[PDB]
C-alpha cells in the first residue's frame, strides 16, 4: 500500500490545506500514532489538534484504536463519493435549457417566451411588441447565463483531471495491486 499512500500524497496536495496537510503527513506512517506524541511533535494547539482530529474523524480518515492511548488509520473510499455527487451537481448547472431566446422588453424588463411575443408579434412592423407597452422586445439578455456556465464548468471541472491524472491512475493501479 505504498502507492495507496501515493493517492494520499496527491489528495493532500489536491485538497486539504497546510494545517491539515502537516497532520496528514504524519498519518503517512500507519505503524503507531498516539495523541500525546502527535501533539508534542506537530507543535500544534491541543484544542485545535482535537479539532483537526475530529475533522479527520468526520472523514472516517482514521480508525481510532483505543488502548487511553490512541492509533489512527485510513478509511476514505469517498474519493468516489466526492466524485459521483460533485459530477451530478456540475452536470445540473451545466445542462442548460434551450436557446431559450424569449423576447424581453428593455423598457419594463419584462420577460417573454418566443411564444409570448409570438401572440404579440405585430404584423404591421414585422417584429415583436411587448404586452402593456408597445416598445420592441430584446434577447433574454443576462437572465441565466447557464450556457456560459456550462462551457466554463466543462473547461474548469474537466481541466483538473490532468493534474489529478497522476493519482486517478495510481489509485486505479494501486487498487488493482491490492486485489
Amino acid at each position: 500500500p505504498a502507492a495507496l499512500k501515493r493517492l494520499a500524497k496527491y489528495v493532500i496536495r489536491g485538497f486539504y490545506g497546510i494545517e491539515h496537510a502537516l497532520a496528514l503527513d504524519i498519518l503517512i506512517r500507519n505503524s503507531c500514532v498516539k495523541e500525546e506524541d502527535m501533539l508534542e511533535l506537530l507543535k500544534f494547539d491541543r484544542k485545535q489538534l482535537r479539532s483537526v482530529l475530529n475533522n479527520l474523524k468526520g472523514d472516517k480518515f482514521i480508525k481510532c484504536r483505543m488502548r487511553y492511548f490512541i492509533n489512527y488509520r485510513t478509511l476514505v473510499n469517498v474519493v468516489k463519493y466526492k466524485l459521483d455527487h460533485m459530477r451530478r451537481r456540475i452536470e445540473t448547472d451545466e445542462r442548460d435549457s434551450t436557446n431559450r431566446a424569449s423576447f424581453k422588453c428593455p423598457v419594463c424588463s419584462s420577460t417573454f417566451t418566443d411564444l409570448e411575443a409570438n401572440q404579440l408579434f405585430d404584423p404591421m412592423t414585422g417584429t415583436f411588441r411587448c404586452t402593456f407597452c408597445h416598445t420592441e422586445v430584446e434577447e433574454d439578455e443576462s437572465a441565466m447565463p447557464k450556457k456560459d456556465a456550462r462551457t466554463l464548468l466543462a473547461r474548469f471541472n474537466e481541466q483538473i483531471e490532468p493534474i489529478y491524472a497522476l493519482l486517478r491512475e495510481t489509485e486505479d493501479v494501486n487498487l488493482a495491486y491490492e486485489i
Binding site: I18, E19, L22, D25, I26, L41, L42, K43, F44, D45, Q48
Partner: protein, 97 residues
C-alpha cells in the same frame, strides 16, 4: 566566565560570597548548562544562530521537518521576516498555529 561577566558589567564588587555562590551554584542549578570545561556556553539552540542554510533540517525527511520552532528566532538582526522572504524564496516554509 562569571568573573569576566562581572568585569565587563563593572559589577565585580558583588561580594566574593555571592560571586562564589553564583559560580558554583547559580550556574549549576542551570538546567542543561552546556559547559565544555572552564567557560559557559549556549544550551537551548544546538545550532548556531546563523540565520541561514537549514537545508539539513529540510532534507531531514524523518520527522516531517523536525518541529521548526520560532521561539529560537526573531531575536537576530532581521526579525525572521528578512530571512523568511529569502526563506520564502527558498524551500523554507513558514506557518503558525
Amino acid at each position: 566566565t562569571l568573573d569576566e561577566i562581572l568585569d565587563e558589567t563593572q559589577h565585580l564588587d558583588i561580594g566574593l560570597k555571592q560571586k562564589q555562590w553564583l559560580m558554583t551554584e547559580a550556574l549549576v542549578n542551570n538546567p542543561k548548562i552546556e559547559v565544555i570545561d572552564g567557560k559557559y556556553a549556549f544550551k537551548p539552540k544546538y545550532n548556531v544562530r546563523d540565520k541561514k542554510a537549514l537545508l539539513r533540517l529540510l532534507d531531514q525527511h524523518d520527522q516531517r521537518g523536525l518541529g521548526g520552532i520560532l521561539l529560537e528566532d526573531i531575536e537576530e538582526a532581521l526579525p525572521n521576516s528578512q530571512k523568511a522572504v529569502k526563506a520564502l524564496g527558498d524551500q523554507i516554509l513558514f506557518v503558525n498555529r
